[PDB]
Design a protein around this ligand. Structure first.
Ligand SMILES: *[C@@H]1O[C@H](CO[C@@H]2O[C@@H](C)[C@@H](O)[C@@H](O)[C@@H]2O)[C@@H](O[C@@H]2O[C@H](CO)[C@@H](O[C@@H]3O[C@H](CO[C@H]4O[C@H](CO)[C@@H](O)[C@H](O)[C@@H]4O)[C@@H](O)[C@H](O)[C@@H]3O)[C@H](O)[C@H]2NC(C)=O)[C@H](O)[C@H]1NC(C)=O
Ligand SMILES: *[C@@H]1O[C@H](CO[C@@H]2O[C@@H](C)[C@@H](O)[C@@H](O)[C@@H]2O)[C@@H](O[C@@H]2O[C@H](CO)[C@@H](O[C@@H]3O[C@H](CO[C@H]4O[C@H](CO)[C@@H](O)[C@H](O)[C@@H]4O)[C@@H](O)[C@H](O)[C@@H]3O)[C@H](O)[C@H]2NC(C)=O)[C@H](O)[C@H]1NC(C)=O
Ligand code: HEM
Ligand code: HEM
Ligand code: NAG
Ligand code: NAG
Ligand code: NAG
Ligand code: NAG
Ligand code: SEK
Ligand code: SEK
Ligand code: SEK
Ligand code: SEK
Ligand code: SEK
Ligand code: SEK
Ligand code: SEK
Ligand code: SEK
Ligand code: SEK
Ligand code: SEK
Ligand code: SEK
Ligand code: SEK
Ligand code: SEK
Ligand code: SEK
Ligand code: SEK
Ligand code: SEK
Ligand code: SEK
Ligand code: SEK
Ligand code: SEK
Ligand code: SEK
Ligand code: SEK
Ligand code: SEK
Ligand code: SEK
Ligand code: SEK
Ligand code: SEK
Ligand code: SEK
Ligand code: SEK
Ligand code: SEK
Ligand code: SEK
Ligand code: SEK
Ligand code: SEK
Ligand code: SEK
Ligand code: CA
Ligand code: CA
Lengths: 465, 57, 105, 464, 105, 58
């Protein structure tokens, strides 16, 4: 139905095509869209609401899975070493790749037909969507097995269950540290970080840790960071010939590229030594996602920004001004007031031409339109929403890594040494990595150091007598 | 439901005569949680979900 | 929920002992505001031809993309102070937090 | 069947009986209880929640109904006078009674069987539950028809629809004014009233006006105010013979008493000139509702306090301390701390004996245990919940009587003269009524005035 | 929702134009806190014999009523500053605000 | 809807030979909203829900 039909019948909500579209000349066509599953299907009484299929917590559930059967399928159950399952047919210069998934309709197979490389199996279903994503999944798989290995050597009496859990808990903590120490400050900027993420006191069981429906749309700010190519670099950080710069419309679900075009190392180097796209008010999102999203595996190229806005309507999200008010920010009524708020009268004029009032601006569009907080990559609205979400995820998490009783004070001192560059050194053939904060460092060789200069994670306080 | 390709390696362990008896029972237990109660059930599930199982005679 | 435990559950169940589904998988999102639907309870804005939102026509999402989002991609501004890894961590992290299911065809 | 069985099978959650019960010696018995209807029935995925069948707004929907078919059935459709329907078989010394409802199992018929007087029909289904309530329903019915009549005389061109709506809008405003000017300050006391209900600015469309689940339980603080009798008084405010003091367990669903034992005037006088029960920590709720609730119309006498506590569990309400924290109040962990919070270590010890921690104390039980704010009849916890609810109902109501555009500035000046005593004067045979605030005034003759001393509602600004 | 109107609807629908079910009849209550059920999502505390609430036995409602609420009705204290009309307006007002449906027979 | 006792008085108005023509239309329309489309529908509903309608029979 909704993949090939342009008829608007439940559960399909196709995006209609305007006159004089620059790409889709056929106005009878549409962009496919399935409405998100309701929590209470068929109900006349309830106000429709969507479902989160994952654990809201920062617990590396994209590695381990969010359901018990998946979680056991991701494990290596042929021994007691506490390992995650790895690809049995392919390796990456001797290292683990993710196992292959068995999908009824596998999009990855459609990218390179001769190659016949299916999508990967991971804690989350989207691991194959970009090879850059896949590389990060693969990195964390390896880091689990590395930690489990090291702990086995440290504690020979530990069984597979104990090893897996202890490794899992460490990976969880590493995701939390990189997120809150390194990543979020560069999203929010210092003012908003101080405001929304003040110093951790302790676990608070009255903080609701659920993902808010609005966050599912607000946190798509990152679509403005996307670069129209996948960049691959050799061990000298030079272009890996023959295809150093692949258009993104040729990497979506392209699992074969990880397996057959040289593994994760060239992709990770590209991630480290290429800039993100800057979000600017006149350069919101690139045509590889706006015009060609998933065009290799589907009848038509999607528009990710358009999908975001359709999705906010699907989810019943209030418009820009209601979220400004929620956040305690002024609500502009007029084009002139919106000009002040956006520091951009021209963009204000465009938004009012489309929407008629700032009350009706879709949250993503409004969010990403705001000028960026100093040293952040979102404006005040998105910083409020994103900041509030992540505060709830920290303070309402009983297993937050700093919470009394989760780690010993020695394990905490050890975990504070972790960094994403170190993880890359420990699990790839890469010997030169981003310095500093990895998320700011972007230029080889200026921003790079030898792996030997970086402190490893010392697991000695996980020794058990 | 679907049989996973990496689970083919477990069929090998269950057939390895020299594989530890505890090791086999942990895999037998894993497959029982998925409704597969003999090695014949495991091999037949792998067949139906698309894998070459001809190497098991 | 067990009175003592050491590890997270896989599902997130029992993280919050007083309300043990909170942050667990396969549950409804929390809403920070009342929902805004064309019919009050179900239908998205833009569903019914001619139905306005708050006194104004609903804009085709693709038209908003065309008029506001599109830009000549070759004029892209690189971010001097962010790596592409900064975007990639965001997507990976997002995949720790939320996946919203849709019906299979 | 939850009414007869003690089996715990959906949708039944019967209250089990402790050992050494002062009434129910048989531990195999139970107090009946049906779980409230789920919003999403059958669901694995959703967190269960209950349904409000009424409009949250203070709009007199207990007069007019909350669904369109009932609203039509309550109206007099035989003319264009814009009236609510009245009883066609009985009157009260010439005045309107409520029409009778047609229930397939009518509990009111079971009170006095020889009398054969069924339950009344009103905007809300519980109008017959005690005759004092019925009297207030009847008063508002009359007030509507009186207003509709007066407006017809003022505006002869107005059709039935216009008359009904205009009267309805007035009655809505009168319920709002009585509630917020006279009633709520005596619940909350001055400090909490200022805190939770500061002076109205304007309608705010971002204030969610829904009833919160917890308010359905918290607002049952009023069960502590209930007296074990219905009091009836003659026109000299003396006992109305022969039965001036009926036990409550003989008035539940006793619609016949309104019809046949002399109408609403004796009941309203009793309401005006009798004190409420004080809630005290050692005297929380009376045995007429704790032991004999609805015993005339059911296999066993219910326990209204116990129902409240069972109902909070049915609704998945958090316990006392979670609500204290929500409200920004200290959360006592120990029996000593709970003693300080209650000014009562003895009550604290009893609560901890039953509940084990103040975290688990049911919201009603905890709420009504707290000492009362100065000049209020709830403690801080209930004051927060109740005050917060009513602020939302005011500020999130587009038809709030003070909101720009609902009434003219002249209609507002006129409505400000309304009072409940005036409404009683205008629609009963009573000529002497409570002074002051009706809700404080409780002693004849000290607190009483002649009806002629009270300012009427002037409808001149409704002319057209 | 009509863009202009003069009177309240009967159901309460359209009072709030941006979210028109808000305060309307036959809708779910809003929750000010997360719900606390024995099983996380459905079963009341006291449903399952032996299941504790937050580490403590659930107290029978009737037991609590017996030990806390019961008093000799000969001890009744009348309120000097409140009429019985004060309780009755509460109940009538309550009946403007909330009725929670149950199943019948 | 169950038939209501006060709705018996409407049957009287519809039978009052000298009752206003518009007044009868008001009531005809009211019973039509319920799915009662004749006076036979009205009086048979009143029978089943408990009330005596033989007192009207012409
Ligand atoms: C119209 O009314 C709304 C609603 O007002 C609330 O209810 C009424 C009855 C009164 O009690 C008010 O005092 C209430 O605020 C007002 O909007 C609210 O404004 C406040 C102040 O700007 C907003 O509070 C902010 O919220 C930010 C976001 O976090 C909040 O929500 C999260 C998620 O649940 C929660 O974890 C957190 O604790 C916050 O509550 C926060 O960053 C900031 O510090 C501050 O708390 C509030 O969110 C607004 N609510 C809504 C629904 O929009 C309007 O101001 C008012 N306007 C006028 C002119 O009166
Ligand atoms: C543990 O954390 C909770 C929750 O804290 C919130 O979220 C965390 C992530 C932080 O961001 C905090 O800033 C947030 O407040 C704390 O409990 C909360 O405490 C505050 C202050 O005491 C409570 O707020 C009060 O709320 C009263 C009731 O009205 C509120 O709700 C209505 C309806 O939703 C709304 O309309 C109104 O505007 C209010 O939001 C209000 O009368 C009073 O003035 C005050 O605002 C809040 O409600 C509490 N929430 C909960 C869930 O309990 C704890 O204090 C904290 N304890 C620690 C760290 O020890
Ligand atoms: C690297 C490439 C990325 C994509 C390709 C991609 C694509 C999507 C798609 C297709 C959706 C669903 C759209 C719809 O509504 O139908 C989507 C949603 C979400 N994003 Fe995407 N995204 C890519 C990259 C990012 C980055 C860098 C993000 C953030 C920093 C980011 C966020 C999100 C989020 C949170 C969602 C919603 C998830 C959910 O289902 O709840 N994405 N993205
Ligand atoms: C004569 C006076 C009163 C009663 C008789 C009476 C009885 C009940 C009953 C049976 C319930 C339901 C119990 C259950 O959970 O099954 C009930 C609930 C509510 N009350 Fe009661 N009540 C009398 C008097 C008052 C007064 C004075 C109140 C307030 C000031 C008051 C409040 C309420 C409320 C709000 C409810 C819940 C309503 C709902 O269905 O949502 N009552 N009462
Ligand atoms: C399990 O671990 C062993 C030892 O490392 C390895 O040889 C085997 O392939 C693994 N099985 C998986 C990952 O499915
Ligand atoms: C597809 O994969 C094949 C085999 O792995 C490879 O040689 C080829 O260059 C790839 N490119 C295509 C055809 O897109
Ligand atoms: C309708 O009003 C008229 C005039 O007041 C009266 O005679 C009649 O009894 C009323 N009928 C009902 C059902 O209230
Ligand atoms: C029952 O009702 C009749 C009215 O028909 C009345 O005479 C009688 O006194 C009532 N009985 C009681 C118990 O009061
Ligand atoms: N599901 C729907 Se429209
Ligand atoms: N190309 C363009 Se507008
Ligand atoms: N889902 C619900 Se209310
Ligand atoms: N080979 C494999 Se998964
Ligand atoms: N790239 C490819 Se097919
Ligand atoms: N990422 C995705 Se669909
Ligand atoms: N696994 C363990 Se304790
Ligand atoms: N360091 C940290 Se989150
Ligand atoms: N803290 C910071 Se950028
Ligand atoms: N593929 C490429 Se350039
Ligand atoms: N689509 C392709 Se090559
Ligand atoms: N979508 C597809 Se074909
Ligand atoms: N609001 C504003 Se300028
Ligand atoms: N439009 C803009 Se910049
Ligand atoms: N590094 C590895 Se597998
Ligand atoms: N979150 C929301 Se509406
Ligand atoms: N409106 C809502 Se949830
Ligand atoms: N391409 C463009 Se605007
Ligand atoms: N309904 C129930 Se348990
Ligand atoms: N009031 C009652 Se049931
Ligand atoms: N205007 C009217 Se009813
Ligand atoms: N506030 C008042 Se009437
Ligand atoms: N005794 C009396 Se009212
Ligand atoms: N109950 C007491 Se003190
Ligand atoms: N004392 C105390 Se909370
Ligand atoms: N504090 C107190 Se009640
Ligand atoms: N023993 C007691 Se409450
Ligand atoms: N409080 C007193 Se008098
Ligand atoms: N209330 C008093 Se004094
Ligand atoms: N109100 C509540 Se949970
Ligand atoms: N937990 C909840 Se709504
Ligand atoms: N008698 C009557 Se409705
Ligand atoms: Ca997670
Ligand atoms: Ca109402």
């Amino acid at each position: 139905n909704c993949e090939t039909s342009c008829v608007q019948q439940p559960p399909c909500f196709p995006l209609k095509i305007p006159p004089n579209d620059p790409r889709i000349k056929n106005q009878a066509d549409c962009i496919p869209f399935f409405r998100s599953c309701p929590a209470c299907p068929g109900s006349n009484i309830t106000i429709r609401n969507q479902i989160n299929a994952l654990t809201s917590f920062v617990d590396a559930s994209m590695v381990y899975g969010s359901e018990e059967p998946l979680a056991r399928n991701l494990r290596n159950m042929s021994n007691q070493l506490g390992l995650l399952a790895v690809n049995q047919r392919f390796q990456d210069n001797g290292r683990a790749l993710l196992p292959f998934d068995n999908l009824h309709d596998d999009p990855c197979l459609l990218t390179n037909r001769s190659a016949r490389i299916p999508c990967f199996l991971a804690g989350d279903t989207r691991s194959s969507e970009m090879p850059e994503l896949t590389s990060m999944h693969t990195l964390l798989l390896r880091e689990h097995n590395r930690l489990a290995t090291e702990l086995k050597s440290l504690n020979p009496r530990w069984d597979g269950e104990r090893l897996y859990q202890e490794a899992r808990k460490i990976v969880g903590a590493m995701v939390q540290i990189i997120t809150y120490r390194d990543y979020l400050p560069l999203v929010l900027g210092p003012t908003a970080m101080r405001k929304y993420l003040p110093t951790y006191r302790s676990y608070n069981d009255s903080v609701d840790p659920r993902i808010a429906n609005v966050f599912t749309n607000a946190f798509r700010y990152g679509h403005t960071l996307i670069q129209p190519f996948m960049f691959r670099l050799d061990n000298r950080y030079q272009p890996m010939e023959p295809n150093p710069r692949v258009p993104l419309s040729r990497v979506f679900f392209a699992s074969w590229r990880v397996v057959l075009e040289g593994g994760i190392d060239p992709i990770l180097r590209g991630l480290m030594a290429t800039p993100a796209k800057l979000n600017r008010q006149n350069q919101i999102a690139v045509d590889e996602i706006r015009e060609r999203l998933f065009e290799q595996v589907m009848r038509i190229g999607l528009d990710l920004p358009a999908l975001n806005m359709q999705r906010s309507r699907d989810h019943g999200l209030p418009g820009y001004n209601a979220w400004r008010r929620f956040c305690g920010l002024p609500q502009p009524e007029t084009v002139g007031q919106l000009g002040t708020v956006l520091r951009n009268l021209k963009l204000a004029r465009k938004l009012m031409e489309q929407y008629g009032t700032p009350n009706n601006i879709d949250i993503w569009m409004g969010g990403v339109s705001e000028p960026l907080k100093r040293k952040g990559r979102v404006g005040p609205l998105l910083a409020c929403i994103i900041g509030t979400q992540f505060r709830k995820l920290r303070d309402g998490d009983r297993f937050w890594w700093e919470n009394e009783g989760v780690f010993s004070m020695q394990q905490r001192q050890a975990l504070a040494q972790i960094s994403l560059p170190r993880i890359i050194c420990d699990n790839t053939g890469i010997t030169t990595v981003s310095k500093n904060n990895i998320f700011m460092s972007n230029s080889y060789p200026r921003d790079f150091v030898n792996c030997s200069t970086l402190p490893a994670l010392n697991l000695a306080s996980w020794r058990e007598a | 439901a679907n049989f996973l390709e990496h689970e083919l390696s477990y069929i090998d362990v269950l057939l390895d005569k020299n594989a530890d008896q505890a090791t086999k029972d942990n895999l037998r237990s894993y497959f029982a949680d998925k409704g597969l109660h003999s090695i014949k059930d495991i091999i037949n599930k792998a067949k139906q979900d698309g894998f070459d199982v001809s190497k098991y005679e | 929920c067990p009175e003592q435990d050491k590890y997270r559950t896989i599902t997130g169940m029992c993280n919050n002992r007083r309300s043990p589904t909170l942050g667990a998988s396969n549950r409804a999102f929390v809403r920070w505001l009342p929902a805004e639907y064309e019919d009050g309870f179900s239908l998205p804005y833009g569903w019914t031809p001619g139905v306005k939102r708050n006194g104004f026509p609903v804009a085709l999402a693709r038209a908003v993309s065309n008029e506001i989002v599109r830009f000549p991609t070759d004029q892209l501004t690189p971010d001097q102070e962010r790596s592409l890894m900064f975007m990639q961590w965001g997507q990976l992290l997002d995949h720790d937090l939320d996946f919203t299911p849709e019906p299979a065809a």
